[PDB]
């Protein structure tokens, strides 16, 4: 009906809550919001990998599903009137990105380094038609070229090179608040602390830096240092180079989710570390055990149902295991009644 406007703020959340003719081989599943509610997107094998999106709760069956675009890396979100999807298809050295708007292709973007073009593999954020998308091309264990592409009505308005102090950017998760978008993701090459990118679609610009929190949120990682730095990356850990995650940052209303093990993708916990944006000596408060150390975890992402009938946005998250869990709660406070 009307283009979405990021005006409602992000109020405090205390404790997380449970929200989550056959199934296909679904891998890399994320969640995307729309005026009708929330849907789950996943890549399925049917050489012909395709995205399939289904309603919350319902099992993936060939009666309530719809394909967005064809590829192996992808992203998608909504702007209030239409849904914008991006997929990457083609050979590894000649990858091309196809953009779909209201179910038909509208734009093709070619590669610029020719070494596996990839996207954020999560949801995107749309503000008054401007929908930033972060893409990367090049080595996954060295310097790579990262660009930010701004879409509107399925058309390009600006492609700009990455700025700031970020060194490696892959598979990012973005959330919008107060008109500004914050994207948190993986440093696959050197750092063990996640970078953060601030995007302003008003002035049509972005800036990049790191997280100042001393609580590292990547796997693998070393023991948490005394003074987490947000200008230069912190290197360590073995053998895993990194894992996709997320982080909500609203000063005192901050949440960081990380695997239990410092070397393996086992378990999942969260911490309310106050002032995750700037504080270097910050320490966590509210703990909540989401996934125990016994079973395996995977890629974790963040999504917000901006079209809620509330004065807030009520952020939410998902963690993979295989199956996955989508969780988010309210001001109700932690206790023996929470899981």
């Amino acid at each position: 009906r009307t283009f979405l406007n990021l005006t409602k703020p992000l109020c405090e959340v205390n404790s997380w809550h449970i929200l989550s003719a056959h199934i296909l081989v679904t891998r890399e599943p994320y969640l995307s919001c729309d005026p009708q509610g929330c849907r789950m997107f996943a890549l399925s094998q049917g050489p012909f990998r395709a995205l399939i999106s289904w309603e919350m709760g319902q099992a993936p069956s060939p009666y309530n599903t719809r394909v967005e675009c064809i590829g192996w890396s992808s992203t998608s979100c909504h702007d209030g009137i239409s849904r914008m999807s991006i997929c990457i298809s083609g050979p590894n050295n000649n990858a091309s990105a196809v953009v779909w708007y209201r179910g038909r292709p509208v734009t093709e973007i070619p590669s610029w380094v020719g070494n596996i073009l990839r996207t954020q593999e999560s949801e995107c954020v749309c503000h008054k038609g401007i929908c930033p998308v972060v893409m990367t091309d090049g080595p996954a264990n060295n310097k790579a070229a990262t660009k930010i592409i701004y879409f509107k009505e399925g058309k390009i308005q600006k492609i700009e090179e990455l700025q700031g102090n970020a060194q490696h950017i892959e598979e990012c998760s973005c959330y919008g608040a107060a008109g500004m978008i914050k994207c948190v993701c993986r440093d696959n090459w050197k750092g063990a602390n996640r970078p953060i990118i601030t995007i302003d679609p008003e002035m049509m610009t972005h800036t990049s830096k790191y997280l100042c929190s001393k609580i590292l949120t990547d796997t693998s990682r070393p023991n948490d240092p005394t003074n987490g730095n947000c200008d230069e990356p912190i290197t360590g850990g073995s053998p895993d180079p990194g894992v996709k995650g997320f982080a909500f940052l609203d000063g005192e209303n901050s949440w960081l989710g990380r695997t239990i093990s410092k070397d393996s993708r086992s378990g999942y916990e969260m911490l309310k570390v106050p002032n995750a944006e700037t504080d270097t000596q910050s320490g966590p408060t509210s703990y909540q055990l989401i996934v125990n150390n016994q079973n395996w975890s995977g890629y974790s992402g963040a999504f917000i149902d901006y079209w809620a009938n509330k004065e807030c946005f009520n952020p939410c998250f998902y963690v993979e295991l295989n199956s996955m869990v989508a969780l988010c709660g309210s001001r109700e406070r932690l206790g023996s009644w929470s899981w």
Epitope: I260, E269, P284, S286, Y287, Q288, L289, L334, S336, S338
Partner: antibody, heavy 129, light 110 residues
Framework: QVQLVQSGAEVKKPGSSVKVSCKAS????????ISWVRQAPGQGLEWMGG????????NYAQKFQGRVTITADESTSTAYMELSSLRSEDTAVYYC??????????????????????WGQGTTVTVSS | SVLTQPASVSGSPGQSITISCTGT?????????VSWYQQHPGKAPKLMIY???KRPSGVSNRFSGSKSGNTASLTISGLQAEDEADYYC??????????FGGGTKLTVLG
């Protein structure tokens, strides 16, 4: 595979201070709560103390308040447990146990149920003259 | 406050034995955080039952747990061979402290 190794037996004079160590299999206390339990010879167990190093919170039993001190060193992932003013009735077996923290919040009851799902071989302490 | 156990119970093989542990309302009745441990002479205690009526990795099905008021009950159906040991009940209190029961000696003749 041993998870926790404490030390070994020890005999101490009355009135002194005893210090016992607990080291995890991995050199990291990520979210594990380390408890310290005591067992008298042939009577039963007795919960003595607990520590959460991630939030740095130390809790002691009612009887042992002001006498038992539990500290954590994340550099070597070593939990130190100390008694002062040892008496002749302090001869027992001290064990260090580990548990998985579930939730933590200051207003509500903190230090959620983490149990005793992992134990150690034990450390015998004997007080004599 | 210290929880209380009967004293010592025993029976013939093929029978079911129930061990009861009662305390106060602020430690046992309020929270479903009662655990059960078994200990053999010269061996460290093992977490037999956690979360009132849940079993850890392994553990024979013969061990079962139940709760009623301020009473926690452990039932062993068909005491088979060597369950003779010292059994203890533990509870979590409102003051972030753990309380241990007196202990029960389950002895099996040969």
């Amino acid at each position: 595979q041993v998870q926790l190794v404490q030390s070994g037996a020890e005999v101490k004079k009355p009135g002194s201070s005893v210090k016992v160590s607990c080291k995890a299999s991995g050199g990291t206390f990520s979210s594990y709560a380390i408890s310290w339990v005591r067992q008298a010879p042939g009577q039963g167990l007795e919960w003595m103390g607990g520590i959460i190093p991630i939030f740095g919170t130390a809790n002691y039993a009612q009887k042992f308040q002001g006498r038992v001190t539990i500290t954590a060193d994340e550099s070597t992932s070593t939990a130190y447990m100390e008694l002062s003013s040892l008496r002749s009735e302090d001869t027992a077996v001290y064990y260090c146990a580990r548990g998985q923290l579930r939730y933590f919040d200051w207003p509500t009851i903190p230090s959620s149920y983490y149990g005793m799902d992992v134990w150690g071989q034990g450390t015998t302490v004997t007080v004599s003259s | 406050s210290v929880l209380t156990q009967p004293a010592s119970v025993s029976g013939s093989p093929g029978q079911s034995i129930t061990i009861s542990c009662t305390g106060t309302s602020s430690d046992v009745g309020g929270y479903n955080y009662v655990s059960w441990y078994q200990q053999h002479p010269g061996k460290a205690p093992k977490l037999m039952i956690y979360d009132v009526s849940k079993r850890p990795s392994g553990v024979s099905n013969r061990f079962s747990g139940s709760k009623s008021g301020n009473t926690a009950s452990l039932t062993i159906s068909g005491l088979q061979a060597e369950d003779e040991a010292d059994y203890y009940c533990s509870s979590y209190t409102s003051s972030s402290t753990w309380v241990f029961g007196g202990g029960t000696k389950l002895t099996v003749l040969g």
